[PDB]
Amino acid sequence: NQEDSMIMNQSSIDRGLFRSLFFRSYMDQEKKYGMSITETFEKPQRMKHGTYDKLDDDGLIAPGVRVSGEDVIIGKTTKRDASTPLRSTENGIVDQVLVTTNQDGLKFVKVRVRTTKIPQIGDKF
Amino acid sequence: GQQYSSAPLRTVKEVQFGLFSPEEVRAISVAKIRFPETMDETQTRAKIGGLNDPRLGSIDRNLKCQTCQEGMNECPGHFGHIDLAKPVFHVGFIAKIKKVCECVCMHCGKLLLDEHNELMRQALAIKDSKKRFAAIWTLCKTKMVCETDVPSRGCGNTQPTIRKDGLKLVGSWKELRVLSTEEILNIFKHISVKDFTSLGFNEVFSRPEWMILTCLPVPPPPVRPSISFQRGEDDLTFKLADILKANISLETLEHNGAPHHAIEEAESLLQFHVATYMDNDIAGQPQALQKSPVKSIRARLKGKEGRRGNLMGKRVDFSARTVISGDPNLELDQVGVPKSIAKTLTYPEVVTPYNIDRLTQLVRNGPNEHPGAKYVIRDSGDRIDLRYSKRAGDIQLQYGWKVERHIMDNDPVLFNRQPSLHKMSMMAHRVKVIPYSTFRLNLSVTSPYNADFDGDEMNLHVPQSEETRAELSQLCAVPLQIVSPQSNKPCMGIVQDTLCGIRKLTLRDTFIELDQVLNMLYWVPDWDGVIPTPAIIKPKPLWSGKQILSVAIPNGIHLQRFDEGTTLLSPKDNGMLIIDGQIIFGVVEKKTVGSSNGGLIHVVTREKGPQVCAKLFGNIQKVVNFWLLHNGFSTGIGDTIADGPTMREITETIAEAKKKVLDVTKEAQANLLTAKHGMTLRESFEDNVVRFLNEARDKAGRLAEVNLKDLNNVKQMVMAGSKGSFINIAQMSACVGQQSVEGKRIAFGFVDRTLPHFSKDDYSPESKGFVENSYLRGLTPQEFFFHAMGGREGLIDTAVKTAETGYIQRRLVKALEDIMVHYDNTTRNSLGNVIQFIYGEDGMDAAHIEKQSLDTIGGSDAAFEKRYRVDLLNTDHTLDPSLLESGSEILGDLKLQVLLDEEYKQLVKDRKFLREVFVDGEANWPLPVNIRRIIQNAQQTFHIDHTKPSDLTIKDIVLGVKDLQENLLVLRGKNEIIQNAQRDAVTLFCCLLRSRLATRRVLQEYRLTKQAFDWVLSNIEAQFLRSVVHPGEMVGVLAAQSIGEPATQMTLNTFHFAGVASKKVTSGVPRLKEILNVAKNMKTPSLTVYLEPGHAADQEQAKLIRSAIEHTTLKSVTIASEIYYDPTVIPEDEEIIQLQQSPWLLRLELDRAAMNDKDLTMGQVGERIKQTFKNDLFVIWSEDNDEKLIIRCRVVEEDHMLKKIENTMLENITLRGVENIERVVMMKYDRKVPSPTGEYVKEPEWVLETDGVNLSEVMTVPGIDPTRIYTNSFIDIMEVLGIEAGRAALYKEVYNVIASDGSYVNYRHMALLVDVMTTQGGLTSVTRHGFNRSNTGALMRCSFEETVEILFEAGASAELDDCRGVSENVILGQMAPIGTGAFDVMIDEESLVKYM
Amino acid sequence: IFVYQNNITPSKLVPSIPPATIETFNEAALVVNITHHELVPKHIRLSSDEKRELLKRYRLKESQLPRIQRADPVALYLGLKRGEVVKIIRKSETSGRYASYRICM
Amino acid sequence: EKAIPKDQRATTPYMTKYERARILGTRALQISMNAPVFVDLEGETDPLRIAMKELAEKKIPLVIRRYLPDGSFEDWSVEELIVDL
Amino acid sequence: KDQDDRDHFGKKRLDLAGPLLAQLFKTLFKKLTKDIFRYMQLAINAKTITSGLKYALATGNWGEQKKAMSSRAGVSQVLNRYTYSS
Amino acid sequence: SLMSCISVGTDPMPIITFLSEWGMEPLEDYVPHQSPDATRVFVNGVWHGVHRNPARLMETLRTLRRKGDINPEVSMIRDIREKELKIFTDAGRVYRPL
Amino acid sequence: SFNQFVDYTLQDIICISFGKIYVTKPMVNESDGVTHALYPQEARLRNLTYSSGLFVDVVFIGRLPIMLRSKNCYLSEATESDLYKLKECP
RNA sequence: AUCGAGAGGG
DNA sequence: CACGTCCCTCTCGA
């Protein structure tokens, strides 16, 4: 606890003390391109260097699915890829996926990924 | 990668700056830029043979370039070009073009002047290239005609007074002519081959005709790239198409139908693009914008970010960063690195029989296993990723491969907080891989980085070669850095937990029993495993706190400290004495175990070693902390409670203080305020008022400290020095105090009142911002707000006024870069120019220097004899035979008493010399080799018998010393020049030597044997020869930090006390900025003028001197002025009058109080009026006996022509005193002077300070000491007393802002900067013009302000960069001739076979 | 040497004799000798055989030497000229006596 | 070209910490590149500790060419330079 | 009488959401009606108020039409929501 | 602050109008060297009136607000020491309640 | 300060010259579907502008963003159980 | 992605 | 009339 840092009771953390929830909200949409040619969400056949497998064939991950590193939480096509990989720095659990359309009618996607943060040696209080 | 090229490999030693010719651009150009089209043959990925890769660099990663087949990574790029249809002024040379056209016959092409003119043959003598070309253009723009002889030469056309409209030039004749680009170009081309050369130019590298662009160089893609997502070119690739668009308009607009008005437009348009293209932040101009502004090439290079943040500083591989936490079970020179970092951070180890067995295991462990590896690099060199390579298992390593392996336990790493204002803020530690994602560092290495473990973040860098490795461990190791040159003291020491519990431990009440003692003993890894016989035995074997502590202190240490009343039988366990690494008496606190000038840390690192002390740090953090673990220590609101008749006592102090300040409050309410001299009644009042609170609030802070027992916790932490200060206890328990914003108290934001809850015009302390309550009691609604105002003022210092000190340092570090001690002990720069002849005027290193006392100086002339004089021809004054071996057989010996005289004679020649250098009689100064220590470390070593006599001859002592001095080398040399600067360099040290090796002292108080003596001589010789600074030391970049760190760092701890102000941002940060920039408009020009020699203590001489320089005018005494018509009409005047002109009267009344406040009368006032106007005015006046003091003047339109005489008579009429001298304060200072008995004594003497600086006149006054006078305006002193006299004033004005808060930096640093500006001829300010203008290498001076501009006039004057300054090598990617680079390393076939 | 009381005609008239240095000082600054002041150290002229010595013994180039202004209140007092060097003995708080050298730029 | 002879030396006779550091480093980098070890590798693996043992026995075949400001220099052999530290 | 205090708060104002919109709406409506006086030579634009208003509330820079170089940048910022008090 | 609120903008005319109706001499016909001791009136930092009996009006207006017939946000000062009366329908004044 | 801008300050800026100006509670016009009952949460998730509407008698003008709890905003009048059912927070 | 804008941390 | 400390972490908009 020296120099204005502190000692945390791990027993009390295990019992839940200062356990945080965390959320992230990746977004993407099907872009419209002049001659009505538009993008599309889907598992493709260029590709990103991460694990597409956790995707579905609608280019999405369904909630309640663990995810790590550069996994794909959103597959898209402009073959010609525009898939959205997970934050290279987070290891979460998919929470809730949303699909609606724009004021242009574009297929609009928002993935939410959930993690519980746990008071670690180095955390600020 | 980069393939191998046959080409030889060299380093860059010369950088030739010049200018392209239009013909050389056409030469190198790998492809003519014909089209403005991006890269669109058919907008295919195939680019267009017109712009982008017509042969230049490649645009596609999967495409080799059309010139050098290497493609992408390897292709330097290849410049193109576009032939300009019409010449164009270069944006940067625009003004330099004019400066030339002003100098040369715009028709003849020859110079407007030549060698037949006295000033031109003078200016031409200047071979300084740029100072000549300035001294030419100065006296050339005037003479505006092509002369024909005037004793022939040469047609005669008058020259035009040229001016510039922006991108175009014009000159008047008598004719409005817009000077043409080609016409100027045609004039420049005809300039005499030798004419332009003598004009600051060059025959081959920088012809003037090339400041006009006839052919533009196109940079290849790598300069103006293009990235895909589809594509999109670079802001400069656009700007080029813009230039080419503007050109192709001219190409055709001028080929066919020439409409002249259009031709003269698309040309000016093109000139625009070529202009902004290079510089788009121009003087006038709109500053172009493309669908916006645009990126000028000059903007790429502008300081801070842009090759100053691409070359002076880079982002780097092999680096890391995370949160830092503190560890008491780590070693000082370590850094707990999280596992993950050590799996991403690697080190390219080379495969060798020494490591091959370890290396292959790692490889098999792979990139996932902690002690694994990531890459393997073969003979061929292609990288082999151990995560994906199939052969990541059956891979067989070869000797000479590289195994980029994980960083393991005990590798050297560069560690650093980020405010890198310190040599210490970047240290090298041993890696110690550990879990959790924090960097962990030993709590004692916090103070160097100024790190706490509160969301603090630290970088980590990792070497890549075994030599940069050794470079970190042999120079930048944390223990290597334990004692700083900054303040020649330890910069690490015990802090926090360990400190608080180490005085708690080192007590007499504090005893440790056996079950606790064996635990402590074990924690010491270097423990001798022997149980110390217990200080207390039998009742119950107990051990003293200090006693048990001593096994961690290493046997061989002797330390000695005396506090207040500390005896040899310590009263309150006072002071400190450690003998042979065991504690004798005294409590251990900050003084003992901190980073004290002569603390335990300091002593252990010198007489034992760097790494020895480091282990000491841990050996104490492991024990002391362990004891505190099981003793425990806390702190509550209970510790901020006095309440018991000490809060009944304090409250009274604040009551009278509201009456002692109410005293003056009512005094001046009825005028009865005896206003101080100089400071008005209001100013005065507040000054006394302001300290009646601060002196009372500070008296409740010692009343607080008193009640609080020795069992108080807040009190305990401050006693050890753990944390906390005197103020803290006061504010928390007693009283907060006045809140100071901008120095002064809380002012009246509302009209004449401080708050809408307060009476108007209320001056009381409660209204002006005095917090009568403490933090315990809790402030009031008002007390809080003011305290909140004062804090902000602080929070502003700590966040807004830090940019002042971070900038002064940048300048410091930039004007002192190349400054390093050289191999002849010269302190030079990158030109070889001598800044000093021995670093710190004694060639010493700042770390081996310690503040010991020269007893030869201060003290009684009587005691001097007693302590040094040895009279062999005498029965009373001779060394009693009990102290020498031959005291009775040498008693009376006269051939020997000749040397005891020679010795005693050089001692007095000493004493009287020191009193010349240290006029104030101060005898404690810093010098190498702690002699006060060495003799002690010799008494314990040979066990000196205070009874038995010494086995030394007078021959031994006085001659050993005489020979010891000859071997105390600084500069090694042969001729008299250097030898005579040897004597000098040492001279002072030898004074301490002869002082402490006095033949009386050696045998009376030291009791040295022979062996003990000779031992002391030889160790002194080395401890000195070690203290010599090392040729390589970057003393300049070091003094810069040493001066800049405390300034930037002091104004970061300003809110730790909230509203306190003090001299943080009052005379420190401010004046220092003045001092560095020099600047004549000093904010407080003061002349501290010392009195006369004789009558210095009697005031009347000072009161008479006061009025002789105070300066006085009519305006001073005058009350009112009135023009009258009267040819004899004034009532109260008609009496004084009975005792040609004009009926116009000028009548002015004077102030009685004023008139005699300056010891004035009327006749003096008058006679000067008569004298300033002579027999052209008629003047009369009353008397001092008169009721109305009046002067009546007649002229001798004249009513408004007389107002001129009044407004001239008021402020321009000089009475007594010297001009500019606006104020004068008389003051009595206590100056130390030697009494007739020889001892220094405190005899006051009167001195006067001014609010004006006219040195040239005030010194010549009769009645002062013209040798002691002093003005803080060092600028004026350089002007009056010469540069060398100024240098001292400069230093004195630098030190005077350093010795206030953070009151120590070592002479050397300050003197170097000081000498830096000095040794030029005059004051050379630390500013982008002051020093940056020197003859340094071009790139060097461009690394600090005026970045693109500097590189311009470099290539325009065909400048050459030496490549000797650090910045140069940094920009070039070469080892800089800096310490480890100041030498070269070679292998002689001889040696290699001597050990074949 | 001439001592103009309050003024001198610019009737320029000074540098006019080859084998003569035409020096000029005013009466006002000569009232108090500046070289007596606390901060002004001993300035010593260097013989042309001393300069040519110090320059080779410190292996120097003429430019590299610390410079003293031509019009320095002390450079005139000693009647320095271009190229003359002046050893300077100041009492330093590290060596007691420190030898510095300045050339008259 | 010019240079200085070993009987006209004048530089500090001890080893500059920067020289010692760059020599311990230089040899370490060379020793780790499979260069001959001129000292008795007594159970050593680290290429720095070998160089520290090589500099403790002064069996380092290197000469420090100390450049003085005037351009000219004066080599000192590692084995002749004292090592006070 | 004293010198007028520059930082006296009772004399400094606080342009809030409404007047901010006013400054934006006017410079916008002023330019929509300039396009109206061009329609002479409903077919009158409407994005000029829609987008030009979105433009400011999005960037934060306060429109000043579109070309707002260093002119009022940082007025519309996204809301913090790590705590309620935040 | 918490209590802190910001003005919003009132129309001045129904307040300028109640000034003339109660003792304001329009600036067009002002007699300086005749009615010199006359506190100046300032509606939104503009001067278009002066008054004979100031304190009686500071009280007359001060209760129009405290009633409502004058908006509660408009702040009004009388610099008795300087014989002046500034009134504000200004939009942007930060006021607290007391 | 938003309302006092709405309930008046609008018709002021208008002064071909136009008459009193009318504002619509916030709706959005999407690709097919035309009039969408646009709410805060709706546009918050769907990434749309909480834009009201501008109409004046000389006729459509543009879209005015409405601040929540303001004049032309729906939540101004609504209640706890209303917002709870509106996926909005009380 | 790049430029701009902003909010934090030490 | 040109500088205006050092790094580090995220958000968003053509």
Ligand SMILES: Nc1ncnc2c1ncn2[C@@H]1O[C@H](COP(=O)(O)OP(=O)(O)OP(=O)(O)O)[C@@H](O)[C@H]1O
């Ligand atoms: N603006 C800044 N510029 C440079 N360095 C800064 C700046 N702000 C903080 N620092 C550095 O970070 C540290 C700031 O101190 P810190 O914020 O850790 O507070 P503290 O002194 O622990 O405060 P407290 O009194 O509340 O304990 C110092 O080491 C300082 O050098």
Ligand SMILES: [Mg+2]
């Ligand atoms: Mg901190």
Ligand SMILES: [Mg+2]
């Ligand atoms: Mg802290």
Ligand SMILES: [Mg+2]
């Ligand atoms: Mg802080």
Ligand SMILES: [Zn+2]
């Ligand atoms: Zn190429």
Ligand SMILES: [Zn+2]
């Ligand atoms: Zn001619």
